[PDB]
Design a binder for these strands. Structure first.
Ligand SMILES: Nc1ccn([C@H]2C[C@H](O)[C@@H](COP(=O)(O)NP(=O)(O)OP(=O)(O)O)O2)c(=O)n1
Ligand SMILES: [Mg+2]
Ligand SMILES: [Mg+2]
Length: 342
DNA sequence: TCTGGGGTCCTAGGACCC
DNA sequence: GGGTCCTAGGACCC
């Protein structure tokens, strides 16, 4: 019993919406992120800017060093959110079985759909179309019998394209598929696997599951499965937010508690308004805080607590500030809450 | 050039329970 | 000693 999964992905999502709305931004390098002086990074960039080597999650310092004409934008989340909602409604026209992964992404299970002669390919294509219509933005797609494979597929013919992997193509596909392409294998893991000669799924198929479990625990099992092409992960649609936090990095490190306090004062209303949106009584399971120093180490203090309370956060933030700052500078203050379990 | 902010999931020791 | 809650931290993703 094979399934039909479609990963839809908006390309250069933030950038795209900026360009739709401002056509002057179209053929010149632009990016969303914090400024040089604000210690910020790039959220995303448009394709003119990628040309120069500008990637997401990358320090704006490096970004301008690479592309001095870069246009920096602060970004408008309601605009992106509005787009998101729209594209999710568009998904809803084709299935209910929809698992968003973020603003711009979603898994669809279309197996039991009778829309386009059960053609997942025509479904994805009809979805990329109608998204370009009524939004004037561009989406890419990947079709596969499972989640991860559809995900890797969605970035194969981007921008403005889609890629299908049938079960017959799968084994061939996995052979040369590098482990780092698998979602959940970042830099560190990739580096351990390389260090033991593992680069592609091909390489792990020849490995022993026992040893892989000994070395990576449950992550080994995951690897092994994904390598065999196995991904029994069901598309969900029922998933819910488990937590919420608000954090900030200042332009210069701060050294006095008064300043840390001054930060918390400004962060709390934010955290409150945001939590109210989904929990008007403000009733939480745990709250707590977060500092990160100059030596970038990051500590968090969080405890059980009935309802978002400002002074407690201030208190525990002072404890934290004393009991483990050892004279280091501080670059970010952050508040956090863990929502109740329903 | 020097490292966001919003999240998820996983691990692991002690506490606590049986 | 096996669950499970508590807290801290790390790797990962968008
Ligand atoms: N590290 C990251 C990665 C993505 N993002 C945001 C900005 C992007 O517009 C958005 C979409 O995620 P993404 O698909 O990884 N990025 P983007 O859509 O630009 O990549 P492509 O799909 O265009 O290749 O998430 C971020 O803020 N920080
Ligand atoms: Mg994406
Ligand atoms: Mg995208």
């Amino acid at each position: 019993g094979s399934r039909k999964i479609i990963h839809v992905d908006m390309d250069c999502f933030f950038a795209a919406v900026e360009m739709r709305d401002n056509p002057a931004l179209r053929d010149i390098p632009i990016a969303i992120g914090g400024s040089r002086e604000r210690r910020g990074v790039i959220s995303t960039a448009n394709y003119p800017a990628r040309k120069f080597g500008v990637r997401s999650a990358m320090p704006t310092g490096m970004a301008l060093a690479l592309c001095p004409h870069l246009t920096l934008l602060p970004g408008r989340f309601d605009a992106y959110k509005e787009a998101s909602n729209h594209i999710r409604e568009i998904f809803s026209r084709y299935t209910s079985r929809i698992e968003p992964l973020s603003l711009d992404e979603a898994y669809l299970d279309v197996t039991d759909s009778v829309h386009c002669h059960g053609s997942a390919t025509l479904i994805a294509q009809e979805i990329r179309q109608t998204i370009f219509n009524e939004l004037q933005l561009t989406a890419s797609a990947g079709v596969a019998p499972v989640k991860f494979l559809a995900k890797i597929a969605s970035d194969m013919n981007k921008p403005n394209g889609q890629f299908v992997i049938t079960p017959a193509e799968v084994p061939a596909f996995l052979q040369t598929l590098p482990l780092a392409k698998i979602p959940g294998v970042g830099k560190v893991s990739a580096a351990k696997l390389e260090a033991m000669g593992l680069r592609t799924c091909g390489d792990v198929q020849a490995c022993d599951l026992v040893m892989l479990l000994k070395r990576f625990g449950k992550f080994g099992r995951i690897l092994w499965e994904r390598s065999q092409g196995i991904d029994e992960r069901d598309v969900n649609s029922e998933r819910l937010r488990k937590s919420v936090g608000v954090e900030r990095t200042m332009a210069e490190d701060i050294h006095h508690w008064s300043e840390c306090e001054a930060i918390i004062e400004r962060l709390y209303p934010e955290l409150e308004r945001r939590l109210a949106k989904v929990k008007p009584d403000l009733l939480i399971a745990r709250q707590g805080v977060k500092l990160k120093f100059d030596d970038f180490q990051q500590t968090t203090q969080e405890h059980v607590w009935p309802r978002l309370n400002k002074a407690d956060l201030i208190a525990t933030a002072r404890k934290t500030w004393d009991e483990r700052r050892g004279g280091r500078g501080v670059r970010l203050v952050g508040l956090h809450v863990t929502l109740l379990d329903p």
